[PDB]
Amino acid sequence: SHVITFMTRLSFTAKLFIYALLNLMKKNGSQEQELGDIVDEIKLLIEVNGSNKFVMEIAKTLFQQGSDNISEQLRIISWDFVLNQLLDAGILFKQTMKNDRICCVKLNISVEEAKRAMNE
Amino acid sequence: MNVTTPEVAFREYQTNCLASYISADPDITPSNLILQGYSGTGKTYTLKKYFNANPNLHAVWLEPVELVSWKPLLQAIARTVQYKLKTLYPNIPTTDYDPLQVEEPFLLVKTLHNIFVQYESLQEKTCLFLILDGFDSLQDLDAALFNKYIKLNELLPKDSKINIKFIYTMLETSFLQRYSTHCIPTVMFPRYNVDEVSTILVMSRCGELMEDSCLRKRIIEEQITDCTDDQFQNVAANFIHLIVQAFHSYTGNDIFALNDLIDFKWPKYVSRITKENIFEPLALYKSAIKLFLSTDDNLSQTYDLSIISKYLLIASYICSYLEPRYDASIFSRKPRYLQPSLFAIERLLAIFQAIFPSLMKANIEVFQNLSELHTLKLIATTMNKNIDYLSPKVRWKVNVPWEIIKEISESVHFNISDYF
Amino acid sequence: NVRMMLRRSMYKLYSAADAEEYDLSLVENFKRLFGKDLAMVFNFKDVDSINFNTLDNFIILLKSAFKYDHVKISLIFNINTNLSNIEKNLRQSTIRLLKRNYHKLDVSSNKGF
Amino acid sequence: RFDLVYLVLDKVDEKNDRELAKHLTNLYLELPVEFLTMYISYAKEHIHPIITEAAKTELVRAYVGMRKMGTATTRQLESMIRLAEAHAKMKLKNVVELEDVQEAVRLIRSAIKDYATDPKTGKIDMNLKSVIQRKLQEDLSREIMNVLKDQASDSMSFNELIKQINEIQEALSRLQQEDK
Amino acid sequence: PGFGSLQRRLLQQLYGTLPTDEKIIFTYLQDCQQEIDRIIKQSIIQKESHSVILVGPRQSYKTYLLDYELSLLQQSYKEQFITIRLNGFIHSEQTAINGIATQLEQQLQKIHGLTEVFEKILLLLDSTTKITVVFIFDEIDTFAGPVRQTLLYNLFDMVEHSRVPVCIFGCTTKLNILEYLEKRVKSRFSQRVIYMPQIQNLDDMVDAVRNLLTVRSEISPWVSQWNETLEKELSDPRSNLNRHIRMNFETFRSLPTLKNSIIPLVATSKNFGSLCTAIKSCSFLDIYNKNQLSNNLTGRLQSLSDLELAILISAARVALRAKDGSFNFNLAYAEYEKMIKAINSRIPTVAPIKLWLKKDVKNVWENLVQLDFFTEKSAVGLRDNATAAFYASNYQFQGTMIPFDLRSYQMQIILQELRRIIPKSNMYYSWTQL
């Protein structure tokens, strides 16, 4: 499908978000996942790797932007921008609550094609 | 023309950032702009201060706080711009369109296009900024409303001389994040630090109380010949530093909250000033010790109730916090932090009869006192519209906290504390 | 709600002003419309039953009137039990507005025999 | 208080079944124990290794790393020396080496399967190509293309290159396939 | 001082407001731009009815291309095209009909110096010609209201029967556009969906940056010095200024969002002499970067007072112990009371720290709800539409009536994040855990 051609060109943030969401789906045995659980599993998967300098640089760029001194964000940079981008493209369906960490994130696309795009 | 930047302190990034999106060239400035910061962060003060330093600009000030819903907001834009163009360009012969005819956002575009055509003969394109202070502070607000203002400029004829360069300010963060993908040029205000709050009120409120009526009466009464206005400022300044250190953990890092305690306690602080308090604030603090030990933000035998009234309330709290399971176990001769549960009226009367000091029975006075408590709002019901007490589906609950009832039982000599 | 409060208050204000000889713009336009200063006294006839969330917002709404120089406002509170009920439900930011200029009065029939 | 806990799991894999099956099926057709006992008795008799200064300090970081991931009581710190001595005794080295220390720590990690265990709820991964593998390979390849040419030579030994960046073969092989 | 003229040129170029003779199209966009250019000219010059949708994310230079081609056609074909603009947000289905008619009348008047309403567009043209109508739309999917899509269903029908050629374009970010365009409208639409190209290499981004930052007009002699210094910071992949872009590239690949930070750097620039010192190291995007993050959860947490933090920590402790994660004022104070007792108890006594009163904590409690650390048990939050918000403004929930000390809240920050952020110099750090 032509959707995969757009999936394969997403930024690294989108790919990591989708992969973490799929892994949480396979762990939970359910499709929708709590939004806080997703950002917790992102940290889990980032830090499960070794303390190699490449991993350290990637993590610093992702979570605290890799800035000079100003740091300590609770969630990764552009975590809202890419969430909306997936949401506004119709791929990602989310319900509306002003409480961040109790809303459920749900997928519209088929279960298989997301992995297929990620496997490419 | 280039724009001169003001000297506002503790905001020396935003006062420089607005030099980007606000300029005399309408071909550069963006069509949407957002200033985001919480209450007491100075967004209204900073924006107004910048504009008053560049008189060559043209802008319209509106407040959604007064403009309760979106319909007034649209109408005010149409009405004020119509007046503002006349004020700027009185020489141009122009006609009028009724600003009360605005019913939908399309009509605004219709009216604005009609107005802007009348100014087609202008020498140059005119950059105009529309300012709304506290956009998200609108009383009746929805997500789709803000998108209606973002894409408004491109529906105008792009060759029009008049360009509407909207300006908005937002308080919250869960509201702005829904529009992150639009990448609207945004300039940010964070909360003020403790040090800045102390300095802000020193610079702002010093001159206010140096010239109040209360002190200059007392100074003559105390016959302070050596007093000087330089001393007058520091005398008032010491009050701000002390009250901040006393109540920073109480009020927070807030300017609005502190600006009122500096008012209430001030006359009382003035009274304790004597001939011996001119030079040593430590002694003055000692005299006024009791002022700081209490917030005095409180508005001020707390509830005058009859004997029948007192037992009525005591019985109800048992109903609202004791399980129906325990009614027979405790009273028949055969959770402090939770919200109270509901109960039936028959449960109240039975317990009231059970603990009243042979039977008390239920005369008119007992029900007369019970209804008054509902009128006095010490007991709540399960309804909000067309209150009908005798409707069987309505239930009752206690609206009185534990601490008040504690003192009620003391005057009654009823030992409630042993029932839990 | 706050929307109802602003409209009804202005509706009564205009009706009284109509006998001289619906929003805050009427307050601004009052001196130009009728050539006289306006002094408004609000009578909260029964404070206890009033939704404090609505009332708290409305009081702040009226606070914008201080920009005008020809308008003066007074508030009367019918309190049944004590000041303690007000001090709980109202937001503590709002209470600091009332305390700046207030007078405390008792009107109960029973007073020291 | 147990020093080592081993989680031996059997998975239904056709490939691994043949590996085990053909081992046993041909064994019942048709070092000796004497040497093995002679070795063990010799090792217990002579070697009494002493932990060196270098081996000591690494234990602190090894234990703290498990400590911050918490059930890492001080009982498991006994295993961090008891196993260290037993490894040197097998080595017959009369002191405990840092290599013994790290291998024993790995053995504890492998016995308990920490890498395959959820740090949140303690569950175990069934499986134990990923995007994180991609980026690490991409970032590694990007730096190799610089270091290989940043030095004042057109190329260098891969052994020195690995120690220069690890402080890899697949990444450079792909570059060779692309003739870089 | 005079450099501002070149700075104005840079600022104007960054904003895309250059004249059509100077408008720049990126290489990764040129492929779709030529397809768009072909269809428009074929529909105008060859008088053929056609219909196409442009598809891509927001801030993707999508409607920008439609402006570019029309801005070029105006330079040589003033008499050939008629443009109609509609938008799904501002122009509701009630006001959509008059939107076309008013705009159509404006174009018709300046050229010369209710099914029949759709036909009257051709009737007005045919009566005055004895000019292809270029429909352009934003948010195509949004017109899927309960009212029939005759607003669009008739326009695609006109493709079959237009005596004066009718061409239709539109913008939409959904990848599921055909779900919104129902079967009855589908039968008339040519279905030439054009998904916009994506930025997929750093070479694409840097060249696009080169496209924006190049100055190809000899306005001032320092133009060469600009291009010299510009390519200095893009020739080395490890450049200080390029360092931000690669990090920008890997995080998010929408180009205009990157422009949002560069323009302040260009705008904050004061003079060419000082400009050289700043543009190379580029330390002013870091300050901007934290500015974007100043009012997040971490930013709000850092500005609280000790008492506000202490109650917050105790509030979190109740939430962690509670299975539902909820808490109230009474439980928050009780843990605050107990933790003060514990701290006081661990102190030598006297040989012959204040617990704040329950009243004074109320202001402290109000601050935490304003700053979004707490939230109500079932806080729906902002509604999507005014009609939905109308019900919310009228309905009175339970929380608006229950006492101030018993309104159930929940937490946005977990104690683990507290321990990750709270300075260890804080006295209540030891109470961050259970």
Ligand SMILES: Nc1ncnc2c1ncn2[C@@H]1O[C@H](COP(=O)(O)OP(=O)(O)OP(=O)(O)O)[C@@H](O)[C@H]1O
């Ligand atoms: N840099 C500063 N220097 C001096 N005073 C300042 C500064 N910043 C803010 N203030 C003061 O703080 C006050 C904060 O009120 P402000 O006008 O900002 O309200 P607001 O945040 O727009 O209002 P609302 O919360 O009702 O939407 C200002 O009125 C001003 O007196």
Ligand SMILES: Nc1ncnc2c1ncn2[C@@H]1O[C@H](COP(=O)(O)OP(=O)(O)OP(=O)(O)O)[C@@H](O)[C@H]1O
């Ligand atoms: N007439 C114009 N002149 C200059 N720049 C423009 C013009 N119109 C749009 N832009 C540029 O477009 C960018 C904003 O995104 P854009 O307008 O391309 O999105 P869009 O096509 O409206 O998006 P959506 O898919 O949400 O409808 C900005 O960087 C702005 O400079």
